[PDB]
Write a structure and sequence with these properties.
homodimer, 3 strands, membrane protein, Tetrahydropterin Synthase, Chain A, about 110 residues, about 40% helix, Stomatin (chain B)
Chain lengths: ~110, ~110
């Protein structure tokens, strides 16, 4: 094989997502995903659609996880939520050969309301 | 904005032993090495099913042609120049599928029976 896939850990940013918390507060949360290709072939066979599929599934996973949480609970349970988001996203990315190492919450922006 | 990264580091592949006839009717057995890197990732992936096989063949093809125009004493004497010109000729051909040929080395010039 001449054209090889970089198998090293790389990252992408989850753009800020609007979420209404359990205690009814509209927040704007962004995050980071740390991932690597764990199956060169399986990833390459899905190259044209893998990028935005993984990006969207990350957003929806972040959106769903925080929806069942109190605003205070987002800060304290941050490692538990990150662990939960990792499983969900790792499971959903296996079918195109991508290993997700971490999904971490970054900033919690606060608009009026 | 990509997800699946192509390895951009300079790497090598071996040109298997080739039976060439010199300009002065001496037959030889020549193996070589090609040093290359992907210089255009979008253009390389688009042709992944054919590019590897095509590059290997054109390396062999460039090696056979370069030696065929040369006399045995010239192959002996100035490998440096021959390898330099082979790099140019292979670099021209492989550009259309986003591969930069950095360096072409001639390893062993053997004499079979």
């Amino acid at each position: 094989s001449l054209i090889k896939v970089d198998m090293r850990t790389i990252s992408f940013d989850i753009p800020p997502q609007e979420v209404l918390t359990k205690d009814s507060v509209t927040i704007s949360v962004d995050g980071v995903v740390y991932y690597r290709v764990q199956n060169a072939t399986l990833a390459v066979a899905n190259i044209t659609n893998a990028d935005s599929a993984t990006r969207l599934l990350a957003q929806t996973t972040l959106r769903n996880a925080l929806g069942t949480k109190n605003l205070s609970q987002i800060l304290s349970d941050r490692e538990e939520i990150a662990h939960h988001m990792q499983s969900t996203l790792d499971d959903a990315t296996d079918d195109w050969g991508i290993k997700v190492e971490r999904v971490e919450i970054k900033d919690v922006k606060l608009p009026v309301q």
